[PDB]
Nucleic acid binder design. Structure first.
Ligand SMILES: Nc1ncnc2c1ncn2[C@@H]1O[C@H](COP(=O)(O)O)[C@@H](O)[C@H]1O
Ligand SMILES: [Zn+2]
Length: 641
RNA sequence: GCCGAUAUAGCUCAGUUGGUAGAGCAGCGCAUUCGUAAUGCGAAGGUCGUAGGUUCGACUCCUAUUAUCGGCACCA
């Protein structure tokens, strides 16, 4: 066939060739770097034959794809070893994953951190042998036969219920060991030297909490020892960014055994919270919303009417009086509708935008609590928009804009967008869902927002647009969201009066921009690593003296800053100016004002950043204008940087 | 909720070998009045998450429990 290489060059062969064969033909080096090849776009083992013309490319550890191939092979290496150490182990699923791979295994013996260390040792041993990985395509029968005779019940299920009974599934052979799933594998283990097992945990078979929980063993793997070590290094650096840490170090809040999953906001944490509170408010005024507030508990009936009670009563908290059962609200929808139902609304009142910083309480899974990210009590910055279907487009778009508008103040660079389509269990006609799904989609496109569908998610009453942010270790956390609801306002019997003097049920849009205030603070803390932007900073300025001398000057100096609207505390402790500077820089204070005699009756003040950067002595009234400005504009960077 | 692990002073961390819990920092006391990331000396401090149990003896072993860490599942 004729082969066309990355440089347009062509090569002619009179019989089927493999990318490996072609590799040699090109050079002994490239041949030796070969892991796999990319033929006419698809990825195939370097040993697969290329019958007809094709565009070739050799996959090398330089390739992002090689990396994954390598990681996948290590996953097989683990199976190889694991089976030598405890031959009764059943292999389930072992896939590549970000930074590595894992393997779910059914073993009737709880793997201790000692065993996991024994495994990694055996593992490194087999990989050093540098053996060859051999591929062999076969019938869906001998393949089944193979694993049935090997005792692998799981590989069998996958085989007879996930693979076309009329297939030539390829088996991979690592000396005595055999695995069999797609994606190309390594030529020989010479490429699988750098790797390390990490954690281990239970994982349900096939993701169902009703199935058996197997043991999942996680690992990392790279092309070179450098890359691997830089990774582990990155993990360490990441741990110093965790909000639970910084949170404690900076005294932002705490939680206790007696109120699991409920935050106690200490003064400094609450300053941050109240700050986002005014920030949001300023935005609600622009986009023109009303701000209301409803009760914390309401008669359960309201949740029965919407259907929430049936689908979520076990994740809901309730209370009782002699003659009444209440619900501590899980969300603010029903209560806002209650307000809507107050007078008589006409089509002239729409679109009605009603917002609330509402306190939600949900009884989350005990195993799911996570710092400020996943709590049992939180405050949602949500709002519900009551409008006519004609107004949807315009309204949804308004939301989309508001989201990126706000996230841009914090300079987030990774916002991924999802479109959650109808769940299996929902309410509403299939015509309704198409209406809704398409409306969101279109609004997304009309705004040029790339996104992926997420089949199955989406509230029982409507589809959702989910904006998700990431944390220190790149885990996903849903934040802003937009739901299109055509079913609830009717169950809660809400209506306006149309032109024809007829009653119409409004279209309701549920939307939150930050998500929950606790989870957003969770995210900001890790984004700034505790180095909050002057406007969000608990304490903005610390003014210190060097000796009693300057003290009386420092006080009226700090007082001057307070009357100017700057969160400023005065450090007059009898200690070394160096002891102080260390403290507050550690505590992440943005600006530190120093006062030696040279400043006292000299007017000025000695300004320095927390990044470390003497800005030199400057004019009082000037540092004030300068800060009030940094603040007023909620800027990410500080003075002269 | 599930699998595994962890829980020691205000914080960080020993004692994770059954034979009286021990450090640095912080706090307290005295001294030090100092020019941009930690001043010196001193006297003290927990009863080992909680409840049971085994044991001559338990921080160490066992059970139950609560929370937390790492995942899975869940996430209106
Ligand atoms: N348990 C929780 N803890 C903290 N924030 C949450 C929690 N559940 C939901 N959120 C946030 O609130 C938003 C709206 O939640 P939901 O009303 O369930 O759509 C989510 O997108 C998250 O940002
Ligand atoms: Zn809502």
């Amino acid at each position: 066939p004729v082969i066309t290489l990355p440089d347009g060059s062509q090569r002619h062969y009179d019989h089927a060739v493999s990318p490996m064969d072609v590799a040699l033909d090109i050079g002994p080096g490239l041949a030796k770097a070969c892991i796999a090849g990319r033929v006419n776009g698809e990825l195939v083992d370097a040993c697969d034959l290329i019958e007809n013309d094709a565009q070739l490319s050799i996959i090398t550890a330089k390739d992002e794809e090689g990396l994954e191939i390598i990681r996948h092979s290590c996953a097989h290496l683990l199976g190889h070893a694991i089976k030598q150490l405890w031959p009764h182990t059943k292999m389930a699923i072992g896939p590549v994953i970000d930074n590595g791979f894992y393997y779910d295994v059914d073993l009737d013996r709880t793997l201790t951190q000692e065993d996991v260390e024994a495994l990694e040792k055996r593992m490194h041993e087999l990989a050093e042998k540098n053996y060859d990985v051999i591929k062999k395509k076969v019938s869906w029968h001998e393949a089944r036969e193979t694993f049935a005779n090997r005792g692998e019940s799981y590989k069998v299920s996958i085989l007879d219920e996930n693979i076309a009974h009329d297939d030539k599934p390829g088996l991979y052979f690592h000396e005595e060991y055999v695995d069999m799933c797609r994606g190309p594998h390594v030529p020989n283990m010479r490429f699988c030297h750098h790797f390390k097992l990490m954690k281990t945990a239970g994982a349900y078979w096939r993701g169902d909490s009703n199935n058996k929980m197997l043991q999942r063993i996680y690992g990392t793997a790279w092309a070179d020892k450098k890359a691997l070590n830089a990774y582990l290094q990155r993990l360490e650096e990441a741990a110093k960014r965790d909000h639970r840490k910084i949170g404690k170090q900076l005294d932002l809040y705490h939680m206790q055994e007696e109120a699991p999953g409920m935050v106690f906001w200490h003064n400094d944490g609450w300053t941050i919270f109240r700050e986002l509170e005014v920030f949001v408010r300023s935005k609600l005024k622009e986009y023109q919303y009303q701000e209301v507030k409803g009760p914390f508990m309401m008669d359960r009936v309201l949740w029965e009417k919407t259907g929430h009670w049936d689908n979520y009563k076990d994740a809901m908290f309730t209370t009782s009086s002699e003659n009444r059962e209440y619900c501590i609200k899980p969300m603010n929808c029903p209560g806002h509708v209650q307000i809507f139902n107050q007078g008589l609304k006409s089509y002239r009142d729409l679109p009605l935008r009603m917002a609330e910083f509402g306190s939600c309480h949900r009884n989350e899974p005990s195993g799911s609590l996570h710092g400020l990210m996943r709590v049992r009590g939180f405050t949602q910055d949500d709002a519900h928009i009551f409008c006519t279907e004609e107004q949807i487009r315009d309204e949804v778009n308004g939301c989309i804009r508001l989201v990126y508008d706000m996230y841009s103040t914090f300079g987030f660079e990774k916002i991924v967008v999802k479109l959650s389509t109808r769940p299996e269990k929902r309410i509403g006609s299939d015509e309704m869902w198409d209406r809704a799904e398409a409306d969101l989609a279109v609004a997304l496109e009309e705004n040029n927002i790339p996104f992926e569908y997420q089949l199955g998610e989406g509230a029982f009453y409507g589809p959702k647009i989910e904006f998700t942010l990431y944390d220190c270790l790149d885990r996903a956390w849903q934040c802003g969201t937009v739901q299109l609801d055509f079913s609830l306002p009717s169950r809660l019997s809400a209506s306006y009066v149309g032109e024809d003097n007829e009653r119409k049920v409004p279209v309701m849009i549920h939307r939150a921009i930050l998500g929950s205030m606790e989870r957003f603070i969770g995210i900001l803390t890790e984004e700034f690593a505790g180095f909050f932007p002057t406007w969000l900073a608990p304490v903005q300025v610390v003014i210190m003296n060097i000796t009693d001398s300057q003290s009386e000057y420092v006080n009226e100096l700090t007082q001057k800053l307070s009357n100017a609207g700057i969160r400023v505390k005065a450090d007059l402790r009898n200690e070394k100016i160096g002891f102080k500077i260390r403290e507050h820089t550690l505590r992440r204070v943005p600006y530190m004002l120093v006062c030696g005699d040279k400043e006292v009756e000299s007017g000025k003040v000695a300004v320095r950043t927390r990044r470390g950067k003497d800005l030199g002595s400057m004019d009082v009234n000037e540092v004030i204008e300068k800060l009030q400005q940094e603040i007023r504009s909620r800027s990410l960077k500080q003075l002269e940087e």
